[PDB]
Design an enzyme around this catalytic site. Structure first.
Site, short mmCIF file in Angstrom:
data_model
loop_
_atom_site.label_atom_id
_atom_site.label_comp_id
_atom_site.label_asym_id
_atom_site.label_seq_id
_atom_site.Cartn_x
_atom_site.Cartn_y
_atom_site.Cartn_z
N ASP A 29 16.63 -3.26 2.76
CA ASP A 29 15.16 -3.26 2.88
C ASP A 29 14.87 -3.37 4.31
O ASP A 29 14.74 -4.55 4.43
CB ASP A 29 14.73 -3.32 1.15
CG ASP A 29 13.40 -2.61 1.07
OD1 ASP A 29 12.68 -1.69 2.32
OD2 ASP A 29 13.04 -2.86 0.27
N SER A 55 7.75 0.99 -4.59
CA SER A 55 6.95 0.08 -3.27
C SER A 55 5.87 -0.02 -3.73
O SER A 55 5.88 -1.12 -4.22
CB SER A 55 7.35 0.86 -1.86
OG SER A 55 7.11 0.30 -0.91
N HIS A 103 15.42 1.03 1.61
CA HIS A 103 14.04 1.36 1.30
C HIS A 103 14.47 2.82 0.28
O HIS A 103 13.20 2.80 -0.67
CB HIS A 103 12.90 1.25 1.70
CG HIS A 103 11.62 0.60 1.50
ND1 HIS A 103 11.70 -0.22 0.28
CD2 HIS A 103 10.24 1.25 1.18
CE1 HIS A 103 10.76 -0.11 -0.08
NE2 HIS A 103 9.72 0.83 0.29
#
Length: 258
Positions: free
Chosen positions: A175, A130, A207
């Site tokens: 996501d 991320s 995610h």
């Protein structure tokens, strides 16, 4: 013919589980380092060989523990892996990039004797989740000596990274934190056409996919690290002529598949 080659002839199945090296861990205390928040080093035991090093960053709000499975997974297939904590869980991607750089300097210069003995500091690579994956893309720009970069469900407001480091991005189809239409896909698309690049999109994934054992993440991350860190062309088979039912999308410029 390849002095950096390690471990068995790979099978896809084997790349979904821990590999042939037992793994030790060393805790890097936050206080002992200026440049990142400490972390955990995962490294091979039961060997006299040396291996490439990987620094890995977690994402926004996250600790090193959020990638512990993957640090162990990689180390067990023959790497020295430092998963950091960041100075603050709210640090942004470009800060994480600089902390990855500090982590690599620490690994080379300051790690314990048992770790140093296993590390070939000539051969280094980065990965991250991320915002940490945004950091991975940035440090790849900054440091063309890196062998590989693996951004995992990456997030960044900058969409264009001018790097010559081979990049494999994992996107998660579903996501909601770093939607692939806004982050992973533009990152892929805008990397130079001359840089080896792959995008793998995990079918229906969230995610959080990189924060627990995930077969496809294991296959692709090991394979990319092996191919470039170790020059291990035995892993081309997983990265070329790809039709993978675990994926909703696969893209590459196929530079590694001549």
């Amino acid at each position: 013919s390849n002095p950096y080659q390690r471990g068995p002839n790979p099978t896809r199945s084997a790349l979904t589980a821990d590999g042939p090296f037992s793994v030790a861990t060393y805790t890097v205390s936050r206080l002992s380092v200026s440049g990142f928040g400490g972390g955990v080093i995962y490294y091979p035991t039961g060997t006299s060989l040396t291996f490439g090093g990987i620094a890995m960053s977690p994402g926004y709000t996250a600790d090193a523990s959020s990638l512990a499975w993957l640090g162990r997974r990689l180390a067990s297939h023959g790497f020295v892996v430092l998963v950091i904590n960041t100075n603050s869980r709210f640090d942004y991607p470009d800060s994480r990039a600089s902390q990855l750089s500090a982590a690599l300097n620490y690994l080379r210069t300051s790690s314990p004797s048992a770790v140093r003995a296993r590390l070939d500091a000539n051969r280094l690579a980065v990965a991250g989740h991320s915002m940490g994956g945004g950091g991975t893309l940035r440090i790849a720009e900054q440091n063309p000596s890196l062998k590989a970069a693996v951004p995992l469900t990456p997030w960044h407001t900058d969409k264009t990274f001018n790097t010559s480091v081979p990049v494999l991005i994992v996107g998660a189809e579903a996501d909601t934190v770093a939607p692939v239409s806004q982050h992973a896909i533009p990152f892929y698309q805008n990397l130079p056409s001359t840089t080896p690049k792959v995008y793998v999109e995990l079918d229906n994934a969230s995610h959080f996919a990189p924060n627990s054992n995930n077969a496809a993440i294991s296959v692709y991350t090991i394979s990319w690290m092996k191919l470039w860190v170790d020059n291990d062309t035995r892993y081309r088979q997983f990265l070329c002529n790809v039709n993978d039912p675990a994926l909703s999308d696969f893209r590459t410029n196929n530079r590694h598949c001549q």
